[PDB]
């Protein structure tokens, strides 16, 4: 396998449908990543993880550098070694989670959630080797929601100056700009004149893929998918689309919709644990008293492992007492319904049939 | 199969290896069971139990009474089906954990750790009905440690009382008595005086098993083998021997060459989330820095998934940040752990070099 390959199959509207080959194994998009927290995706073996369909997984750059360290996983062999996972894996930058958990046109220092750190387009970058990311991200600095029209370009600006830092960076690592991949992200947040100078930016810079970033920052589905609207044409149409920390089932199916190929939440994997199963008519409160005696499965059709063994009754009891299994098999099938979703999407779009399929699935969902 | 037959196919010394044959499946002996607190084996899925080797698992009354409640387990299709385990499954009486978590002659009424409960032979043998139990445990009053020779007897002869009782109780229910067994425990704490009555009783009575009650009371394993030494003497020999609440490896090793067929304890089930791993070289904690880097497997010699797919170093890492697999792989081996051991006893019984186990076990064990 080449390092990086990314081929269309198929098409219809803005929706595409095709693979990423890569050294570790090929992605089928469009693709939904589960999150691996702390060197594990919440509850799951890796193999469990691989048997719910999912072809890649993410890594969080900013938990990893605090524990176990950047370091130390590469002592150890590096992250998919580390945790049992050898497909592809994607690492963000971790700039999200140092404000979401001193920023100068240099980088970011800030104190642990009470050690000290630094985070910068060059140690960004450098961090994300040493875990062994099959596909890194450009480090940028987020606008928040919302955002003036002169913060909101300054930001963009600053995050494009340092994507072209993000870009040497990798480059000048021979084991990095050979056997892996990288991601530069738009930025400019709602600002459609914004959005197109930051892709005009990245494009010139060019990278194998471009992420559409600065969105579900809590501005509403719609303003979103407006966003994306006009966003995602102005990618170069030959690469990866990839919308962060976007994965509710609804905003998936609409962001391939419109021209987005990659996905990461750990939606799936926190509401697992909290108690939220979600099935192909909605999300549904296992915690609820309705389902303390219903035999049927999280979801009728799921084709997943827990769903063939376990009832809604029991995983009902497990989670309101706290038991570790109730969080296992939660996780195990939201997981597994998301690759399903994936599934069906890419082979709607492979069979032309993708716009029927987002009515479809919408109809029943919302029903 | 039959209900219920226990056949020795090899001693050494008191020591016994067999098998007991139930509808549900095979036993072997000596066995250890897995604790399945509330309708799971913390952490682990009933297959993974499986494959860990255990041929049966102890499901405890009294928090299953409580959550999800005896009866609704029942509608549901019993304990087996509610859990996912098809194999045996012995449950105790529930009257040890309503004293550990107003007494009469009758039995015992309480409040849930706010609701109120009632506990008695009768009731208690109902319950494990309920539950679908395969083994039955008499109901009795724990004798707590250290005891006086005058209330040690009278609780001793009450739990006699209640043992006729509860035999009475389960005979007196068709579908239990016809398919599932009930074992009878012995009391008299420390005295042997007592202990011989409380065999004698036991024996007149008639159980399709007998366990050893009121050790693991904090008396130290010195004076627990003393009282073994000549308490299982007196119980039938064409019987199983059952001690309760024993599980740490040298304690197990003893109890064996002393005649123990059958143990249960939530040791490497708890000690797996503490952070505790069993190995041959003696007990570890996996937590301590010891370990941050260390890329062998918890034990050296365990065939388990874990120790042939992840190192201390990750699993350090996963307890120290309270992820959820972290206690997964740890009970996982823990389990798997103590099953190779009783296989180990099992096979060193049956080809007359148990003592000589002993002798090498308790050597590195303790090295
Ligand atoms: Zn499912
Ligand atoms: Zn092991």
Not at 241 to 248: A, D, F, T
Request: with cysteine.
């Amino acid at each position: 396998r080449p390092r990086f390959s990314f081929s269309i199959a198929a098409r219809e509207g803005k929706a595409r449908t095709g693979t990423i080959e890569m050294k570790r194994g090929v992605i089928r998009t469009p693709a939904f990543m589960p999150v691996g927290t702390a060197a594990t995706v919440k509850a799951l073996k890796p193999e469990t993880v691989r048997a719910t369909g999912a072809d890649i997984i993410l890594g969080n750059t900013y938990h990893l550098m605090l524990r176990p360290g950047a370091e130390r996983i590469a002592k150890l062999g590096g992250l998919h070694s580390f945790m049992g996972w050898d497909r592809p894996i994607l690492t963000d930058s971790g700039g999200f989670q140092v404000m979401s958990l001193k920023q100068s046109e240099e980088g970011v220092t800030f104190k642990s959630h009470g050690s000290r750190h630094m985070l910068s387009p060059e140690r960004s970058i450098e961090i994300q080797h040493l875990l062994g990311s099959d596909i890194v991200m450009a480090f940028d600095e987020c606008t928040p929601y919302p955002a003036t029209p002169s913060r909101a370009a300054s930001s963009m600006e600053r995050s494009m100056r340092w994507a072209k830092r993000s870009r040497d960076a990798f480059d000048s690592r021979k084991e990095q700009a050979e056997n892996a991949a990288l991601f530069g992200i738009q930025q400019g947040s709602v600002f459609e004149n914004l959005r197109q100078q930051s892709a005009d930016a990245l494009a010139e810079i060019g990278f194998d893929g471009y992420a559409v970033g600065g969105l579900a920052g809590g501005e509403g589905q719609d303003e979103m998918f407006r966003v994306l609207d006009f966003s995602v044409p102005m990618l170069p149409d030959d690469k990866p689309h990839y919308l962060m920390g976007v994965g509710k089932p609804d905003d998936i199916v609409g962001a391939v919709e419109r021209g987005i190929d990659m996905f990461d939440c750990v939606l799936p994997t926190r509401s697992g644990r909290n108690g939220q199963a979600f099935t192909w008519d909605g999300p549904i409160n296992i915690r609820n008293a309705r389902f303390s005696e219903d035999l049927k499965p999280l979801d009728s059709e799921c084709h997943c492992a827990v769903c063939q063994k376990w009832s809604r009754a029991y995983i009902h009891h497990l989670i309101r007492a706290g038991e570790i299994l109730g969080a296992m098999l939660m996780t195990e099938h939201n997981i597994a319904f998301y690759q399903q979703l994936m599934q069906k999407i890419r082979d709607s779009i492979s069979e032309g049939r993708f716009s029927q399929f987002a009515q479809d699935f919408r109809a029943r969902y919302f029903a």
